[PDB]
Amino acid sequence: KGFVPMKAVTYGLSPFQQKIMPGLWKDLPTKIHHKVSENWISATLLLGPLVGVYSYVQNYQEKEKLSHRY
């Protein structure tokens, strides 16, 4: 647990000299599109098996119930 010699240069500005809130809602649709396009595969892989198993169980149960009738 130690540190390293670095050699960098940085500039900063005071907190009380810059607008804070307007950054949240600036350009939402492009951010939403980027997130969706990047994580569509993760969403698919998370939500696939649940839907498949649920549909299969529903179909099996209704078929069995309707086949037990008179």
Added chain:
Amino acid sequence: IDAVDASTIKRVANRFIYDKDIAIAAMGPIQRLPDYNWFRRRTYWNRY
């Protein structure tokens, strides 16, 4: 000059020092120098 007593010192200090912005510049091995917010908060006291 001799018309600047303790009360005037406190008045001018509370006009210029207390709770105002600062400017810093450092050079060298300054990796262990406190960040901006440390200095900025230390310009007033919560004890008083």
